[PDB]
Symmetry: D2
Subunit: 218 residues, 4 copies
């Protein structure tokens, strides 16, 4: 069992760099590590992974995804690493990650996200590493990181953070307090000022309530 | 806290690419993932990892190691991934890996290994992935892979296999039998003929007893 | 979501000691630890566990199972502990355990096993503990423990080992050499002579070929 | 190697029921599961476990410990189950459990604890099961369970909860809210009214602020 375009042995399936335009059929049920990265996949069918309950790592980075079906990861209860970096997402459905209670690494950089849904990470009690850098994020919803007790590495740089708007105060206070975990590069390197306000290029960590106004919020 | 040159958060310590000449002091005891790769480390003190029992991943690839103290990994009972690729090793001490009973990935490519000690891998019951490519190996000892029952991926290419000598018959037989797991690249791709006789450019797995002679052994 | 008769919280489902005659419906898909022991279950529906792929521990001990459907554990790739002790089995279907590649504890004591299928344990590479005591075993198939390299604990006592028959020599030779792992009790206690010949009270590990004859075998 | 009083194979050491008055010498450094239960151990040397970094399960239950040195569990970073049930502890040093970031079951029942230290469980992010039943507890410190996001099973019965005192209100409000995880027996069975006020036999989760007064707090 192995899609003809891929290499498969043991519990690892390598479909990387194969000019794939869709997720191939015949990925074994027993697969733990799935490389689908660096292809030209433009969409996921709902249910494409329903059958792949055993996955520990899902590598989807460097594809062309423009949206993700709601529920698409819902059977992945064992998933430990989810790499979605360098796709073309502009948003994420609510509840996307709620079933990924064992997730330890989540990569969401280098796309075009304009916001995150309000409860996006609330179930990710084991999450350690979270990559949000290089998107179009202006704010982080209030409380968004409050249920991430295992978090030790985060990436926030290269987002047009809107520091004139009162919405930024959650993040700006959070970064000030969790400043040892804010970084850049791969693997992570400590970089606490790397989250910067749009237009002023000043640190998000240094924004005050005085310098913001409800009137600056869209 | 953290070695001065490195970034540390959670249980991950990143000292990669820091022009290091030795293994820095102050790596916390709780470290699980240690990146020491891409430096200019020339040697390891005996005992350097004795206080790092919690390591799961040890990235030592791309350094200048020429030998390894015997027993240097002996405390690493939880070690799951050991990357020694691209160092300058010409041999491995006997018993080097014997304590590593939970090892799942072992990278030994791209150095100058001229042989393997006879029992090298006997204890690695859980080893899934083994990289031996790009060395100076002419032969594998008889029975060398017999006690690697969990092995699903192996790299053997780019070694001067000496197929005129009768010693090559263990390996040639083994490769023919375990064809499905022999490969190339990162991540692994199926490539069972990548192991070639030096010169004749015949695949190792196609060698017959008839073409070999004990008189051609060094 | 929880069977009415059971208690459920997190990923543990306790249906133990509930006077059940069958496996109840409504066991969540996310269940990792499933207690069905100490009931009056007499049989399993084929497919009963097809949906429970996240199981790590399956406690079926102290029921009244007389047979097991083939393929019944086939979807349990993450299974780590399987406890079938004190049921009423007289045999096991071929390949019953083949998909259980992560299995670390397998209990099969205290039933009515007359034999084991030839390759029963061949895939259980990570098996550490195996309980075969208190059955009706006369011999172990030649080679039956050869593909159990992770094995550190085994129980063999209280079986009518037929020491007149030459088939016992696999076992007797194996025990003599793996003597440190043979034992008794819960948790295990070292007990190398506990496995004894039927009628003679002679330890199985001391049997000689001189006392046995192919003429006394099946 | 094994202590002479005990039985050992693989990574399990069985010193249970051996009339031990102290922790014996010669427990291997590679030990993962250590049974020191049902002995007559009355204290632990500071540093006794410093060398046992690989422990996953520590069974210390049914001895006669009266105190525990602070720092004693500090090197047990991999510890997943800690069983201290049925000793004679009346208090726990502050920070006792702070290094046990991977602990999933903690048994503290059936002793003489008269209080818990304020931040006792603050670091136990993965704690799933916590046994506090059968002690001398009158209240639980404010916020004590707030940093146990993984907690799915708790035992609180058979404690003389002082419901007349305002200090009970954290606990009563907590039990009402987390009612589905409150239980009894082994394995856990659901039993939310099992925690009862002394004298009144009123479930703790049913206490009102009106029935309590800061004047009844000694
Ligand atoms: C997408 C890419 O450029 N490379 C991948 C790595 O990317 C990094 O991810 C972290 C965490 O999400 C962070 O956002 C970095 O800025 C980003 O480069 C990483 O996802 C790995 C996973 O193994 O794959 C690519 O190398
Ligand atoms: C630059 C280098 O050596 N690459 C490392 C990766 O490499 C490969 O390792 C596999 C497994 O042994 C095989 O030998 C390949 O030929 C080799 O390129 C891989 O080990 C990663 C994991 O950290 O490290 C480097 O990237
Ligand atoms: C009576 C019974 O089946 N007890 C179960 C325990 O039994 C021990 O199991 C081991 C290994 O199979 C060995 O066979 C012993 O003889 C037997 O007593 C044990 O399996 C536990 C596991 O949680 O369940 C019952 O207690």
């Amino acid at each position: 069992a192995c899609p003809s375009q891929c290499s498969c042995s043991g519990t690892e399936v390598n479909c990387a760099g194969k000019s794939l335009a869709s997720v191939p059929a015949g990925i074994p049920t027993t697969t733990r590590v799935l490389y689908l990265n660096s292809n030209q996949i433009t969409k996921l069918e709902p249910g494409v992974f329903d059958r792949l309950a055993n996955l520990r790592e899902l590598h989807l980075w460097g594809n062309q995804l423009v949206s993700l079906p709601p529920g698409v990861f819902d059977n992945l209860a064992n998933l430990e690493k989810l790499w979605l970096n360098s796709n073309q997402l502009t948003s994420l459905p609510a509840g996307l990650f709620d079933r990924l209670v064992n997730l330890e690494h989540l990569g969401l950089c280098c796309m075009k996200l304009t916001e995150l849904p309000s409860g996006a990470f609330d179930k990710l009690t084991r999450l350690k590493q979270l990559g949000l850098d290089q998107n179009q994020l202006k704010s982080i919803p209030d409380g968004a990181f409050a249920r991430l007790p295992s978090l030790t590495h985060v990436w926030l740089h290269t987002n047009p953070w809107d520091c004139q708007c009162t919405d930024i105060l959650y993040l700006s206070g959070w970064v000030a307090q969790h400043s040892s975990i804010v970084g850049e590069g791969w693997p992570w390197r400590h970089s606490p000022d790397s989250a910067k306000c749009s237009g002023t290029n000043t640190p998000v960590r240094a924004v005050t309530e005085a310098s913001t106004s409800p009137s600056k919020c869209p």
